[PDB]
Amino acid sequence: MSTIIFGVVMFTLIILALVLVILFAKSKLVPTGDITISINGDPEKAIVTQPGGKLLTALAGAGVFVSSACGGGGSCGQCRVKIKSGGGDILPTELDHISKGEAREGERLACQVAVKADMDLELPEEIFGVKKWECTVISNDNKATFIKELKLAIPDGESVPFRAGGYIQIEAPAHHVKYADFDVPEKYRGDWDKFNLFRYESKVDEPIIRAYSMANYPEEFGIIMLNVRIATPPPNNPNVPPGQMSSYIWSLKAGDKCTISGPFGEFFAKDTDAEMVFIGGGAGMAPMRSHIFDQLKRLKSKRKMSYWYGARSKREMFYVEDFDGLAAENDNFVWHCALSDPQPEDNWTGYTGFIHNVLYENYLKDHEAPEDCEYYMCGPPMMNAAVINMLKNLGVEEENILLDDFGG
Amino acid sequence: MITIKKGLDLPIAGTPSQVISDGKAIKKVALLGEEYVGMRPTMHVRVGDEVKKAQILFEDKKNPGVKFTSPVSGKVVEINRGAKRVLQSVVIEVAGDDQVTFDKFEANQLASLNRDAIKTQLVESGLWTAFRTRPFSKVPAIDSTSEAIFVTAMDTNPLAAEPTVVINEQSEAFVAGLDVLSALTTGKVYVCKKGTSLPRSQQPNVEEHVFDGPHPAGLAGTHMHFLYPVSADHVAWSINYQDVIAVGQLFLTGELYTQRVVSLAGPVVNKPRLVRTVMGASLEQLVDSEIMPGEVRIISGSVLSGTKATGPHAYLGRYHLQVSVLREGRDKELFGWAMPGKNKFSVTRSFLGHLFKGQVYNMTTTTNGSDRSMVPIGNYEKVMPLDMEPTLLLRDLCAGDSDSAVRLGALELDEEDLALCTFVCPGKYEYGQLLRECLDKIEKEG
Amino acid sequence: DSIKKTLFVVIALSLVCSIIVSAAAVGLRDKQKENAALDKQSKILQVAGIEAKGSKQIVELFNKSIEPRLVDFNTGDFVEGDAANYDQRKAAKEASESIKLTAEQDKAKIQRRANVGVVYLVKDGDKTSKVILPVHGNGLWSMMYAFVAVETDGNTVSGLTYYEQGETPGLGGEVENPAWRAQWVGKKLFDENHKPAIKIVKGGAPQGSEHGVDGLSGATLTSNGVQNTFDFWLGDMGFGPFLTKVRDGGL
Amino acid sequence: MEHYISLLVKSIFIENMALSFFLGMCTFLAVSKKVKTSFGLGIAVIVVLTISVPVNNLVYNLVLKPDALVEGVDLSFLNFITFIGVIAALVQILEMILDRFFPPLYNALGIFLPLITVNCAIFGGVSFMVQRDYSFAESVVYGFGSGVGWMLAIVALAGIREKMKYSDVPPGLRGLGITFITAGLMALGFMSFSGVQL
Amino acid sequence: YEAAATLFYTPGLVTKRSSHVRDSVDLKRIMIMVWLAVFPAMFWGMYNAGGQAIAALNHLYSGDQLAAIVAGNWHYWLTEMLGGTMSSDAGWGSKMLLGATYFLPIYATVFIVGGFWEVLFCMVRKHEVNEGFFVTSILFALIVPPTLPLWQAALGITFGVVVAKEVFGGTGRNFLNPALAGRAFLFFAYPAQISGDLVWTAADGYSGATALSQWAQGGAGALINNATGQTITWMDAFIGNIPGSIGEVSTLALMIGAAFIVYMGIASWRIIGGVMIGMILLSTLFNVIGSDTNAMFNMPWHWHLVLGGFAFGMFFMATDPVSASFTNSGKWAYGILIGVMCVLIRVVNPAYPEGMMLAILFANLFAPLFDHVVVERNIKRRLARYG
Amino acid sequence: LKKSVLAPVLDNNPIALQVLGVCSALAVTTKLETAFVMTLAVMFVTALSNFFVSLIRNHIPNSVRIIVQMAIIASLVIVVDQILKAYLYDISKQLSVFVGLIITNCIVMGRAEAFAMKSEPIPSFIDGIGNGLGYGFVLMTVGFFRELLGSGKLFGLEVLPLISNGGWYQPNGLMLLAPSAFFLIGFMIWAIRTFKPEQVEAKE
């Protein structure tokens, strides 16, 4: 019995002694002092936080969204920051995302940097322009059998500093929406009723964010135009849940308001004297319209231009009036379109099949310098892969191949 | 001064007689677009266009400002493009004697010209493409400078010509080119040569260095490894002696000088010798009625690092100074691998051939075996005079470990620095392609 | 004040864990000791030739038939003490209770011998039929421990079992083979002059030999180990004087 | 002096922790990819083992050993908790020291730095020391030798794995399985010292 | 058959890239040359095995007992049926025949089983079957006792070919010696059949130790051939008139064979010299230290050379290019380590009388580390801007 | 429920995919009885440590998290050791140091840190049981081959009559040494990743 008490006392004493030693060592070694961070060279808006923690969290608290979309993971980005002091160490986890040629310039991922000492950043000026507007929807009318156009008005008359081809960030809270409430004109409801898609419904639990390219160009002041597709489960896998934000965006009625952020963008045109070739299909119409309108009307460049668009059926074509007007007004721009698998009722006359095949057969097969001109594309992965392969086969270098990408 | 112990002088048959004679008439010349590393051409001509000597044919997208010009006056007759529309050659049919002209200077003024004036003249005339850069063996950017320009006044390739015979005819032009290079260098100019006498330049920048030994002793890679080790921070420029003569002639007479003196030799050449030709000449017409009957392979350059001259590529290379011709060994022999070959060459002592000193072989284009994994019996160490671990470096290249290859010294090498290693590989590997792939990767993502 | 909470949590958790650990460790101590005691007793019964199954039967038979005793190696006389709980290995390791052997004496390569050893007397009644001697020595890979039971004349073996050898199975571990062990019964440890005479014959022992035992096939180093074990433990530095007393009839 | 030299060589070669007792295999197999990373991890293991074995020797001989504190009480059932607590505290203190003074090594093996508490080699070394009843100097020498042997084994495995950049392992074996087979062959080679008793 | 043409003829291929001429040597010739270099050792091993067996048989039995013994063993009565004899006056032909009836079945089994495994792996992986398995199989067949069971030989070759070579990608892709890996598998799996006094002479009921075992027991005075009652001399051990593994006995024949491959540049004289240096150094150190209880302490280097499998390993198994170091400086260290380990295992390890295969397998683990040290020094020299 | 219990058997096996608990696998797999007892002990300890760590997860301070977790684990292992010595004396003797080394078994600490510290008690208990089953799968599979081919026995019952007992089978002596365990685990991983190719590691 006397040994049980000894065992208890010795266990407690040994554990307590080890804990006290660890605490004393921690007190003597770790700094324990606050840190100061300068977001750039050298605004007065220095940030003072406690030691440790993630640099991404510190910037999010300061209000400079990187990114900062999810606060971790490093899955995608557009999650990079520039450092000129403090964080001079190199972490092995950043090399597989940052190339050797650009790592030496002092660029690091925000979600990887650790706040152990005072550091100074070199963020590009564009980041500081990020802020939100509570835009009011002008209209959300339907344009195709699976696509709608959303137009927004900036409150208080504020104008967005942006470059043609940019994209915005859309943020909405949790919601529950049924597909039966969609305001889809009967003109496009034939396939909807054939597939009985109105029976679907969606549920969201927490606020969500997404990115959307804008169909307007700078001369259109105070208006943000977006082209949105319906995230509908495939007929092969109806049991798959539908989209989380596309359903709410489609159900959204005119006159409502939401919060958008940005703009952001890197899919800008190059300032050369060479020809421009634009390729698109379905929802990709927004960046193409932005680029074409900007280049033709605002810049008034004489560079040769052309646009090639792919559609499922003759019912899927929109902006046709604007593009025909542009072609008539300017001899420097001419556009063509082809139907992948139109219905017999379309009574279509013209190019058919894949847009990439049509383009190669009609324009590039006879072009004298396919590599000289620049290629801009945005569309479904099926089209994108074929177009990339065809251009590589023709010998076009990556420096002249540019595209917008989406996924999930 | 410097003696190379490791190497190999290939005892191939048909060695040229070092005497210069007039060559056969040439009707077509071409510029080959695949022999310039990293070149992406922008064509400035089209089939049927008349051209003058030194007129621009195309530029480089990846190297702004560099011009590739016509060696002769005539008409563009072909523009050959291969897989993925890769440019193969631009063929010009000789006609007329039109040309573009430039400024003239006296021998006194050459050593004291502006680097900018020299650069503009060279670039405009198209002679700027004679230079190459270690690492990556690319044409220098027109806005860059190098502290070391290496002149190659020796040739140790098998069946190669004798630089002394050629230089003695153009001593004044050689000296003028040396003066221009001394003005252009910003460091020193290294004239790497053999133990015999050559015309000298009085400028203190120009230094003559003597190399002795078997083949690799005559390579710019070896010369740099021994006199100015190169790396990412230190880059040297390389130019051969005939290009130096061309530079001297350009700056002395104000017009491009496209003459060449190559060696036509090989086991199947009836009368090996040196012949006067023109830059980018047609090898098909050059070797007409000069070879024995049968199926033969014509090579632009040495049998160690040349280019097969077939069809669209049947034209003299830019950096090649010899034409090699040898038979095609498609024969199959019973137990040929087990014979006690008195007529079989090898750097190992497993054949009877090595016992007959001075023997000369009628070598063919055979791979004496099939592809296999590397079993390092120590052949590479016998032919590599540089301070490297050849077997480890080659295994690194084969595995594709570019970072470790750079650490082991890949940045100092050209495809022609591993020709002997490819030669003596029991597994029949070809390390030039692997080295080029690794260098391309380093350049692209570095 | 984080420190207050961390100290409180650590102390409470330590108390809760320690009570359980200590109670478990102290509750099972007697059974843990009894398990080892039973394991020891089983081997002695087996070598003595008494069949026993189960802990109850093992304990009953061991208490009925066996009688541990302590022996002074130098003189072979019995000594008083707790023979049941004596630990000869610890005694040998201890400097106050052991002697450091010399190269000329350390035949078996044990390097140390306890001053007092323990033997077990097999009794079928008032008289004693056998005495069991624990012996050990170095093999090729490890130290090997065995029990040898000798008749009451002090010359004739009745059985031998190796209970801890750790040699190579099939080659050196054959010391545990029942067929090999059965060869020892009837052999005589001493000759007419009362000197050790056990022989581990290489290549097989003669027919009907009274001193030779077949050596292990292909395991001459372990055979040498066994031979050295017996050469030492039958000598003057081992059970020599005690076996002399037994032969004279002091058992 | 011969005693300690023999003990050191025995620990390094005859009783190699990695390839004779086979302890610490999880990290010995995971972190063998690069020679210099293995070198750093082995240095850390050396430091931890050398510091920890003698400290546990002192604690065991002063408190836990039977009859050490009071006549008739044996607290040997606290061996596991005492050993693991000492090892964990030392690992944390070394982690803070490396963080403050050695950012290079800290970032080199930051992920596995806290995982050397669970390395079976250190706990096994402490247990073997307790069994063998070493003195203080013997404990120091034994810990140092065991750490050095573990470092040698892991560095050799890393060298082999680097040499294997030229291999053509089947997809199913690529990685874990081939590393297991390699370690088995290494143990086969290390069996040369089996019969040596030192 | 298809395999016939692809092994007897040459591919008839040409080149495709910048090196338009190639060396005559190839892997096929290299491997066949190494395979031919062990023929004298193989033939002497057969003859010696036959001679030892006949001498032991006539030492043990005679007359009707010998007749019954020969009638009861297929080796013996096949030798007699094919024109040979089993009497004391048997000639070199009879001894060679008796040795052949032991060696040939082992070699055939090893070849067939290992070839099956190699072909299976190469066909499934869609490679081209290549040489070097010839060397592996012949060496494995030569480094085993004459009495090894055939199923054990099959298991050993299976382990060596599959676990050590094919699983890493085949020839040129491994890091360990395949033949020695198979031998070690046998060593540690069935030690009773590859050690002791009952396996090194193929005579029924005969027990006898060999020179390494006898020296460890009683020094140089214990070297006695009990079959003939004579004393083993240095010349006997050098010529190969001693029991042991089949092809290891004749140091003279092994030297004759190795001289050719060393001259041809296939084997590394650097490795051989390193092995010799290490052996001499450690043996002389042991001789100087001395011992009063271990007779192996006073065995000189020239006796170390001619006993056991030292010469065989040094000449033919330590020179495997794939398992060795890839640097000239590292080869010396590799060889020195092999020699030192061999002598150490011979002397201070009482469990094993010989240590060649263990030493080579140990050095196979550390060769890449020597390469690492050398290459790191080279890289530092380069960074100093001296190439 | 069965998802959390059965995933660590083949989909997320500790030894074959996570590389945890290799030492005991190499050590205690020469006899099926010792392998089985080790499997049960690891299951018990991991389940209970997960349960308790999850119970008190909110109140553990970051400064001494390792100390708290290892105190719980070591207490459980000490109790298990006492029970084994009291009731399974022979098997405890055979295991020797590896009963104590359960504390440093990587599986227990990994599951405590990765799951229990952020999950609920019952889920943590189930996760511990599942990981124990996954560990035992490899333990028993290796032990079966090792024991059968090294001693011709299963659970101590003679299956192949040995040559020394008048039988026909000669046991393999390499099956009683670690290299056999290394090779067996390697080939088992090969088979698993052949039947489930999604686990194949990329060439990079």
Ligand SMILES: Cc1cc2nc3c(=O)[nH]c(=O)nc-3n(C[C@H](O)[C@H](O)[C@H](O)COP(=O)(O)OP(=O)(O)OC[C@H]3O[C@@H](n4cnc5c(N)ncnc54)[C@H](O)[C@@H]3O)c2cc1C
């Ligand atoms: C920079 C950028 C710009 C973009 N611009 C545009 C644009 O201009 N126009 C446009 O139409 N799109 C654009 N997109 C695509 C973007 O993803 C849109 O938000 C798109 O409409 C998807 O809508 P969502 O996010 O509501 O659907 P999500 O739910 O994010 O994705 C839909 C898919 O996820 C599946 N899914 C949803 N919930 C679950 C679940 N719980 N489990 C399993 N599967 C689930 C659905 O079945 C469907 O397959 C852009 C993307 C990026 C990155």
Ligand SMILES: CCCCCCCCCCCCO[C@@H]1O[C@H](CO)[C@@H](O[C@H]2O[C@H](CO)[C@@H](O)[C@H](O)[C@H]2O)[C@H](O)[C@H]1O
């Ligand atoms: C990858 C990890 C390691 C893998 C290890 C694999 C081990 C595989 C073991 C295979 C089993 C072989 O088992 C062996 O088979 C042969 C087949 O004749 C049996 O037979 C053999 O012995 C008998 C004994 O009476 C002889 O009469 C007979 O001529 C002989 O063939 C052996 O007695 C048996 O021991």
Ligand SMILES: Cc1cc2nc3c(=O)[nH]c(=O)nc-3n(C[C@H](O)[C@H](O)[C@H](O)COP(=O)(O)O)c2cc1C
């Ligand atoms: C792997 C292996 C293990 C061995 N184990 C033992 C052993 O445990 N005991 C033994 O006596 N011999 C063992 N030997 C045999 C010895 O090495 C030695 O050959 C033998 O003792 C000589 O016996 P002999 O005097 O009859 O020739 C083993 C051999 C090998 C290869």
Ligand SMILES: Cc1cc2nc3c(=O)[nH]c(=O)nc-3n(C[C@H](O)[C@H](O)[C@H](O)COP(=O)(O)O)c2cc1C
């Ligand atoms: C290449 C080679 C390596 C060998 N390696 C070993 C070894 O490591 N251990 C061993 O006990 N025997 C080994 N042997 C076997 C011995 O050399 C020899 O055949 C045997 O010892 C003969 O009996 P003896 O030991 O009495 O001389 C090897 C043989 C050869 C040919």
Ligand code: FES
């Ligand atoms: S924080 Fe989400 S990718 Fe970086």
